[PDB]
Amino acid sequence: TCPFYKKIPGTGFTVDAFQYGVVEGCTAYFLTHFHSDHYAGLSKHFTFPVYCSEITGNLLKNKLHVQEQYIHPLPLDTECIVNGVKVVLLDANHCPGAVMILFYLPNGTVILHTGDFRADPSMERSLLADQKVHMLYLDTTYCSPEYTFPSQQEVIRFAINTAFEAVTLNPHALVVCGTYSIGKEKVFLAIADVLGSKVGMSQEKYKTLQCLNIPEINSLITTDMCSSLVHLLPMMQINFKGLQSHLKKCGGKYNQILAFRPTGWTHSNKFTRIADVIPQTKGNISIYGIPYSEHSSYLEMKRFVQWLKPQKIIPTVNVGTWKSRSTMEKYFREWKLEAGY
Ligand code: NI
DSSP, X not given: OOOGGGBOTTSSEEESOOSSSSOTTOSEEEOOOOOHHHHTTOSTTOOSOEEEOHHHHHXXXXXXXXXXXXXXXXXXXXXXXXXXXXXXXXXXXXXXXXXXXXXEOTTSOEEEEOOSOOOOGGGGGSGGGGSOOOEEEEOXXXXXXXXXXXXXXXXXXXXXXXXXXXXHHOTTEEEEEEESXXXXXXXXXXXXXXXXXXXXXXXXXXXXXXXXXXXXXXXXXXXXXXXXXXXXXEGXXXXXXXXXXXXXXXXXXXXXXXXXXXXXXXGGGTTOOGGGOOOEEETTEEEEEEEOOSSOOHHHHHXXXXXXXXSEEEEOSSOSSHHHHHHHHHHHHHHHHHHTO
């Protein structure tokens, strides 16, 4: 049954709560973003009202075949009413169409649900500034001090300079970028732009990208593998084996691959600065592991919560073991001591 942490007290609302069948007392289902753990259970057979961003609504319609009559898209940074309750959607700095939701409760309580987010100081100057937030439902994916990572921009700059060099040294080289769902599109679009190329990809992935309201999108992507010097493949195919195989299917247009695997965090974040990164090479194939995260580092999360000063915190990630629950509680206590709220 639907956990307490996916229900908003005093409303008929749930968030990201689609895998329990019909939730008793829910008059509206909110969806923060289009990742499968969050939308799990939604299909053409769903017949209740779903609220979400415009981008998320395009993906539900076109990828999950949710009928249009049940989809209610809302604009961002805009005061809206849903079943008698004032709400605002804000940009979550996560994947395309990902949102945080501010609910203004009839009793005067204000609740912020972050969805999945990567905290940034620009959120300290949004509509969140205007009033006191009482409860925070927090994306706690990396809530532990060992989780450090560079900025998105540092990683992108590295990937650009690395690709430009390789293809200038060898213009018959091919750049490949791993992907598995939406997110991290900036990695491949930024590289394709420095090389002055479109990005080539499968039909399925091209369709997904067409849902994301990217301006000038038709000038940036293609299914033509032969005209194109950046290709996308699934993350699991980014190994020497799978890259050699792919190279054999471009029709003798390229003789080399440089590939990127933008991953979350792994054990080599503690030591290696982005400037120190070197690839694994086998013959005419090179693979770079780059830590491109769409979730808050420990320090980014701590700063955000210390600025916001919520009266109560409810975690939404790593909540299934008592050990994680207990550990996260200890960090929230500390954060509250040190900042005095
Ligand atoms: Ni996500």
